[PDB]
Amino acid sequence: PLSPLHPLGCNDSEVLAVAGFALQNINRDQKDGYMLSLNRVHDVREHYQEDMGSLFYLTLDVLETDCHVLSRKAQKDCKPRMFYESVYGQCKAMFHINKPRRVLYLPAYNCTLRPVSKRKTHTTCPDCPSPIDLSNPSALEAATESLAKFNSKSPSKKYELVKVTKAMNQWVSGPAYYVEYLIKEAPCTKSQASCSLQHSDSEPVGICQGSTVQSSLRHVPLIQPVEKSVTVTCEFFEPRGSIQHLPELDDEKPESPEEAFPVQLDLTTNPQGDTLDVSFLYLEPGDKKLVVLPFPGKEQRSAECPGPEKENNP
Amino acid sequence: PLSPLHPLGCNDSEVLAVAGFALQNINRDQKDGYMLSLNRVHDVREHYLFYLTLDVLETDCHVLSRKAQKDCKPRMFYESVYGQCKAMFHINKPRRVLYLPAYNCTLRPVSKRKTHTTCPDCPSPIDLSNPSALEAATESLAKFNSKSPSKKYELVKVTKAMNQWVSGPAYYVEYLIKEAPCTKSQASCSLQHSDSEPVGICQGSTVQSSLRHVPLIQPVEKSVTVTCEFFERGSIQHLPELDDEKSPEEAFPVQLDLTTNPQGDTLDVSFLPGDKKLVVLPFPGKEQRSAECPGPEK
Amino acid sequence: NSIIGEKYRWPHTIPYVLEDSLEMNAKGVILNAFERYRLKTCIDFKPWAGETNYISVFKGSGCWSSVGNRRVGKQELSIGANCDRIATVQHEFLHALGFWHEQSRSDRDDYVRIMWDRILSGREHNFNTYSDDISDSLNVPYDYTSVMHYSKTAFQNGTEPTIVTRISDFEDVIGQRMDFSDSDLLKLNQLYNCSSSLSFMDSCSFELENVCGMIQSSGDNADWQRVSQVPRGPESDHSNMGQCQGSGFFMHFDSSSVNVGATAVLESRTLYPKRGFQCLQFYLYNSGSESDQLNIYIREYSADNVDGNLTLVEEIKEIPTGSWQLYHVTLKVTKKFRVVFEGRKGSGASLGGLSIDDINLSETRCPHHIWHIRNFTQFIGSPNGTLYSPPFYSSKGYAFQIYLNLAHVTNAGIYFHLISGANDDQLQWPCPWQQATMTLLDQNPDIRQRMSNQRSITTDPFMTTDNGNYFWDRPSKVGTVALFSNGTQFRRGGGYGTSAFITHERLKSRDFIKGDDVYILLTVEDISHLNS
Amino acid sequence: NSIIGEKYRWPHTIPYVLEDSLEMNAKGVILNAFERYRLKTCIDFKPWAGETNYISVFKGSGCWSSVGNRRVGKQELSIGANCDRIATVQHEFLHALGFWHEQSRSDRDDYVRIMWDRILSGREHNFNTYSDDISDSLNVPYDYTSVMHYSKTAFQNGTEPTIVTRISDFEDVIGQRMDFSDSDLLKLNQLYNCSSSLSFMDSCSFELENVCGMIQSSGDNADWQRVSQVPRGPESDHSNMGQCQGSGFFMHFDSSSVNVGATAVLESRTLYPKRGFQCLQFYLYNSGSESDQLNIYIREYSADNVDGNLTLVEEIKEIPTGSWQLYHVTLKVTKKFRVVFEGRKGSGASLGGLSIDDINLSETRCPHHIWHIRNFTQFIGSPNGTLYSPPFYSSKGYAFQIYLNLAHVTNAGIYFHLISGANDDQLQWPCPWQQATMTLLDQNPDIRQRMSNQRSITTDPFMTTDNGNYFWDRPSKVGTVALFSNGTQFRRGGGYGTSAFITHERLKSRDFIKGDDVYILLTVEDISHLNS
């Protein structure tokens, strides 16, 4: 074939390391949501141009983790989501890497994720908690009720609610909500003291996991029975493309034709290609052209490239 | 050492065929009881004359029937009679002569306790002199004689007797029958000297139950069956059951010694006029046996 | 009672062979015994097709079997002469499955006493006892009513009982050969891990508010009500009568207060047939007029129409009033189905309604005919207890009549008589191989708990009488003149059955006699195909 | 209800791990749930020792489990906050064994109605229904009383029920979380071919003439007699009272007509223990004087002496007269044994005797204490239904008292209170990890058929009150002054339990209240050993 991009394997030491670097830049570009994890590489193409023009056009299979993109935690300290709350999909990305000049760059990426079918998680786990809308009034109530508990423990700091990032519901023996939310530093000391260094505003300072259980069981005597059971835990923080979230996969369909995660990542529609001015490439003021080509199609797989799943549900 | 008797294999072609001929002569020497069957050869010795010891099982043919071993099936497990038979037979191959001067057998009936743990409702044998077995024998013989329109048969003796519970008493006897003295109007009776010698054997049964019968128009008391089959130096000893407790003692201790002396003796085989002698020796014991002689149990 | 060892276990579906040596009546009886196993246990029987070990039935010296799977290969099982009793077969098969006799338990001496001097000489081994070293009683107490227990007279030498039960009331109870006892199944199903059976489908006595999952849809004008009594009738349910009144419920259709034509429906839950033939039975009380009727439908669910195919299977009209009546409906359903019970008020002044209780559904063959004897208690032991059944027609046109004799101080006898019928000029004489089974129904609410007494006779076309005539020849040739209930003369052929069908004490036990009524379930069938 | 597939089956003895994340109370509760399985099913639980697939109980987000053996390896089961209820554990384990919810059956729509508009937005999947080709109902009718059925309020958005049962009487019945229903076990034991259990040994109600195989030897002077009433008392047996009188039988020892010292013995059949600990229980009626007594012996059979080693285990004196009393005897037998019941006439003018019924023997641990509440019916729903238990001592010397509050129009609540005791100057304060289990006994004749209501609380030595005091500190430090029945003041520490122990309708259901009496079985035990 006349394809400048060679079809490479998915278990290669190089393709597995460059995919990790590509996933690092995708997570660093996101300012809302939770970080992704590389499960397996679906497809890999390497355009080995001279002077290290590696235009790696890879198709990746990812799984959402429990770390918010603002936490900026390492992939080692980020465990994947449980099966009842999983969010998975595909991430088509193009990555340039210049080995002799020590350069790594992600010119464009595009992601498509879908939450696991709530029907499938209740046939496999009837009493499991399933996610609810982030704009649910009850999730918002659980978020404020839990934040009030953390603020009641705080003896000089107050934290406001920014937004609900994750929301879930189940039945313990009555309503049970499991929310995650961003917290901002409340306006310094209300209207008291010199209040110096008040530049801590409109930016989230951390994320809190909370819960509410409203059941009619195990409680103290009539001497002071409690209404709801609240828990709160807080963890503080210390390019052209997007990740689009599609709805649930097949709850209406009792189950291949449609692309489960249709991703569109084309830099140029022309089959000849185009040049990308990478002038910020090392000390070099000139000689910065990067060769590009339209999105690699199907049927050109390496046969040894489905991808060995590093994280299987069973 | 002398050791003229060489230990030979049990599944040998010559040993298996000689045992069959030896069993034929033992059954032909018996005038009372049922014929035996070769299950396996326990041990065999060869001297130039064979001093073999064979494990046997009783069959359903009386020795007077003189039936072939092919037409004689072994007895059922609940009525089995098995044991050992030590015998000596000299086969002169170049002169085409086969003879067995002495044999000795010891048989034991299968333990009635073992047959009722393995088959509770099975029929188990009773004493041949049982009054009820004798009654079942006469009642069945009366049925066969009622069918006979000119020949009458007397009872000689009960050869096998058994009992079980179908839904009341049930007896299963076998007995020898003799041609009753000619009781006709003819004074001569064709000079019939048909003495007390048995003419055949009959299998009979009685069932006395209070179930399946015709209407009050003629209910019958017992259920009788009868079937008759007509005929055309040593001993077999019968020891009692082996129920004793739950191996030391000889299960079938047999004694077949022609001469107690270790040197031996000569047997004048003049029937083979020629001055033909036969070398003999005392009964071969254990330890000097071949490892290829346990015997494949048929 | 049970033998200890995992090697003495048969595979749940036992391979068998029914050798030609067996009597025609024996072959027939054996198969009906296999059906009691299929109905009450997880044990099944399949004709041998090469399996290493298999049971081999045959006319032997009596009736017997080895205990458990002896892993011999061809394992023999005698059904010789006078063994073609059903419970004899169920008994010799319980030996094969791994059971010794009840009185051979380790604990037996605390319950029964063996009178050793009264036993026939040398018959000691028939009274063996096995230690819990080789015999497991499976945590079930000592059962006198066992189908594996000897009678008081087993191996007796005289008129005195060899097995005297220490409690006097049970001295005659021991030895029953009617069906499996409740403990007999308890141990067998424990031994073979039986959780479900082949034939059992449903039993409904309505003693629970959920009424066996019976729904009523949008019951038109009226519906069925779970009541424990109806003022006009009945005073109580059928499951419990002389035991408890209110403690016992049933469904009732009040026709007295609805219009002419009004219908009320009671639809069962979904049932899944695994055979393709069923017997739906139940007790019906009529308290209204003879005009009311109970139609029966079968709502079968095919994949093409998920709303079912309602099909009217039987319509019950003219129900006798003021008595519970047993009814049998023959089904042949192959797909998942529901039974639909529809009461319908006729055009007659009714002061009550239709009452239904004790519903049973099995995958068994319905009786060909039934004999309902009313006011039963007074006939037992009376010289005028010579009952004659109504005339019936066999499936082959052979007319017959059953005779129940209860004049004996102790036993009750049943006899099968052929009689002159309309098809006699077209039938084969003598009557060739028609097996007549007569069963004395134990009227228990649960069909899995009935120890009904069953006997069978097969007409032998070669049987002769003292005059040289064929016993089963044409009744007009060899028969005696008898009268029908209307006084019309008919010809009745010789009787044939048993003088000891059931003792009077056994007849008065269990539920054979319920509401002073008795039921004799009759099945006459051509079994000529069993030999060849 | 059950999932279809051989792969979704666990081995009868399931390997488990009780992860460190679990609460102390939860760890304790889980093990008591394993005992209900051992008593009523053939399912057992063994601590994981390397088996490929195993359940792993951990404190997760609430209570959940996968349905059936997913053959994953480490399979998770979550018993998190507020999941420490025995029936909640029995429920999540029924999911693991292969069961969906009751209202998820294919037929569910004929029995219940799902009010879709009243459910929380997006919670539709919690009301799934499974086709007969993926879920097998195992031929059991629809069960409203299932421990796997949601309550009428599950996922409601308001005060209106989301699951309206089509029959009105069962709208509150659905949702019970007391124990397995009879249908819950019927399907489980069918699924797993359960023929026998680990703990069940014997149940005797004497409703049969063979009296569970109980012999009486050569009973000196007197014998126990199977009667249905005694003129002086009782008028009826214990198994059936307000339902049927003469249908229920019991053993009776007439002391009125024998002389002083006379004894009558009733010896059970041989029992084979497989655990080494047992609870023998029974109901005793005293109709004679307080001088008569019922001694209990254990005849253990060792191989050296085949006649047993009779050993007096308990002697019951001063039996209250004119009421059935529940008694528990603790055994510890390792060999095949018999229980020997000996009534003995004391030296007092008696006009009746000792009556015994409803005997149960299991391989379970007897309650540490029992609370017998008489004249119960009037306290329910009454503002004066504030019952306080007699004072008791824990196995560690901790004095306590139970509080039963029945003043609410709908629910009944139980509370555990510590109180000042004799050992207080020697105990560890605050009270460290003593698990108090309170059970409301369902007084059913058969122990395999009791759905007794059980709750547990574990004293947390770190729990504080609004004043900064330890909740389980010494009652003389943090406690309120209370009065004993004799008017002596004592100190009572804070109560702790539940406001909804049982609804008043559930309390009035089954047999919790028999003969107007109620029994609260109490067990306080140090569970500190469970964490590491």
Ligand SMILES: *[C@@H]1O[C@H](CO)[C@@H](O[C@@H]2O[C@H](CO)[C@@H](O[C@@H]3O[C@H](CO[C@H]4O[C@H](CO[C@H]5O[C@H](CO)[C@@H](O)[C@H](O)[C@@H]5O[C@H]5O[C@H](CO)[C@@H](O)[C@H](O)[C@@H]5O)[C@@H](O)[C@H](O[C@H]5O[C@H](CO)[C@@H](O)[C@H](O)[C@@H]5O[C@H]5O[C@H](CO)[C@@H](O)[C@H](O)[C@@H]5O)[C@@H]4O)[C@@H](O)[C@H](O[C@H]4O[C@H](CO)[C@@H](O)[C@H](O)[C@@H]4O[C@H]4O[C@H](CO)[C@@H](O)[C@H](O)[C@@H]4O[C@H]4O[C@H](CO)[C@@H](O)[C@H](O[C@H]5O[C@H](CO)[C@@H](O)[C@H](O)[C@H]5O)[C@@H]4O)[C@@H]3O)[C@H](O)[C@H]2NC(C)=O)[C@H](O)[C@H]1NC(C)=O
């Ligand atoms: C007194 O008392 C007494 C006592 O009680 C009385 O008596 C009585 O009487 C009466 C009178 O009166 C009577 O009655 C009668 O009866 C008769 C008999 O019955 C029976 O039988 C029958 C027959 O059988 C046979 O057949 C069949 C068939 O085939 C078979 O199956 C069988 O098996 C048999 O067989 C046999 O035989 C034959 C000949 O016959 C031969 O061939 C063979 O081989 C063999 O052997 C039957 O059927 C019956 O059953 C029935 O019924 C019942 C009831 O009734 C029931 O249960 C059953 O199920 C059945 O069913 C039926 O029904 C239904 C309805 O309901 C229907 O649907 C069906 O289908 C059926 O049918 C038995 O078992 C009889 O028979 C009679 O009847 C007749 O007749 C009348 C008069 O005449 C009339 O009405 C009627 O209708 C009839 O007729 C008919 O039938 C016949 C016979 O079968 C014929 O022949 C004729 O023809 C006719 O037919 C027609 O029609 C039908 C319908 O109906 C149809 O089906 C047909 O068709 C078919 O066929 C044809 C021929 O033709 C052809 O062609 C075609 O193709 C085809 O399809 C036609 O269309 C009557 O009922 C009695 O018996 C007596 N009893 C005794 C014991 O005896 C007296 O009376 C008194 N007295 C004073 C003075 O009082």
Ligand SMILES: *[C@@H]1O[C@H](CO[C@@H]2O[C@@H](C)[C@@H](O)[C@@H](O)[C@@H]2O)[C@@H](O[C@@H]2O[C@H](CO)[C@@H](O[C@@H]3O[C@H](CO[C@H]4O[C@H](CO)[C@@H](O)[C@H](O)[C@@H]4O)[C@@H](O)[C@H](O[C@H]4O[C@H](CO)[C@@H](O)[C@H](O)[C@@H]4O)[C@@H]3O)[C@H](O)[C@H]2NC(C)=O)[C@H](O[C@@H]2O[C@@H](C)[C@@H](O)[C@@H](O)[C@@H]2O)[C@H]1NC(C)=O
């Ligand atoms: C708990 O109950 C609340 C009330 O429930 C409603 O009433 C009960 C009796 C049942 O009938 C319920 O099924 C019913 O929903 C829930 O709040 C309701 O949520 C729904 C969305 O789930 C919302 O529906 C929208 O309604 C607008 C029109 O509403 C206007 O007019 C009505 C009166 O005419 C008025 O009441 C409103 O306030 C508004 O002024 C409609 O345009 C929307 O239609 C679009 O979507 C439908 C598909 O659903 C589509 O077919 C159409 O073509 C169109 O695009 C939509 O139907 C209700 O308005 C709202 N009711 C109220 C009073 O708030 C509650 O839901 C939660 O709160 C919501 C506000 C929202 O945040 C949800 O995401 C939350 O789950 C529910 N759940 C919980 C857990 O609390």
Ligand SMILES: *[C@@H]1O[C@H](CO)[C@@H](O[C@@H]2O[C@H](CO)[C@@H](O)[C@H](O)[C@H]2NC(C)=O)[C@H](O[C@@H]2O[C@@H](C)[C@@H](O)[C@@H](O)[C@@H]2O)[C@H]1NC(C)=O
């Ligand atoms: C065959 O076995 C018999 C039993 O063991 C031998 O007879 C026994 O010989 C004993 C003396 O050796 C003697 O005390 C026993 O009473 C006698 N028992 C019987 C039942 O006879 C027998 O010995 C010879 O052969 C038999 C047939 C008779 O002729 C005896 O009188 C002989 O002594 C053994 N046969 C041989 C050949 O050894």
Ligand SMILES: *[C@@H]1O[C@H](CO[C@@H]2O[C@@H](C)[C@@H](O)[C@@H](O)[C@@H]2O)[C@@H](O[C@@H]2O[C@H](CO)[C@@H](O)[C@H](O)[C@H]2NC(C)=O)[C@H](O)[C@H]1NC(C)=O
């Ligand atoms: C069986 O049937 C009849 C019924 O007769 C009457 O009812 C009996 C229960 C009994 O009380 C009899 O005395 C009644 O007469 C009996 O047959 C009668 O027998 C007597 C002689 O004993 C004779 O003179 C009559 O004519 C017969 N018939 C009638 C209708 O009286 C028979 O004795 C009854 N037997 C029994 C024990 O029930």
Ligand SMILES: *[C@@H]1O[C@H](CO[C@@H]2O[C@@H](C)[C@@H](O)[C@@H](O)[C@@H]2O)[C@@H](O[C@@H]2O[C@H](CO)[C@@H](O)[C@H](O)[C@H]2NC(C)=O)[C@H](O)[C@H]1NC(C)=O
């Ligand atoms: C709960 O306990 C006492 C019992 O009082 C009596 O029995 C009741 C069943 C009822 O019939 C009362 O009227 C009886 O007096 C009650 O306490 C009394 O309450 C009244 C005021 O209502 C007060 O004047 C008395 O002093 C109280 N004590 C007694 C012994 O009379 C209480 O009202 C009962 N409540 C119920 C609903 O049972």
Ligand SMILES: *[C@@H]1O[C@H](CO[C@@H]2O[C@@H](C)[C@@H](O)[C@@H](O)[C@@H]2O)[C@@H](O)[C@H](O[C@@H]2O[C@@H](C)[C@@H](O)[C@@H](O)[C@@H]2O)[C@H]1NC(C)=O
């Ligand atoms: C069963 O049949 C056995 C022989 O079969 C016969 O021939 C074949 C070809 C076919 O026509 C079949 O119908 C025939 O019956 C036969 O051995 C057996 O007979 C019984 O036993 C023999 C010894 C005789 O006593 C005979 O009268 C018996 O009936 C047949 N069994 C029965 C119960 O009929």
Ligand code: NA
């Ligand atoms: Na009923």
Ligand code: NA
């Ligand atoms: Na009782």
Ligand SMILES: [Zn+2]
């Ligand atoms: Zn659940």
Ligand SMILES: [Zn+2]
């Ligand atoms: Zn037997």
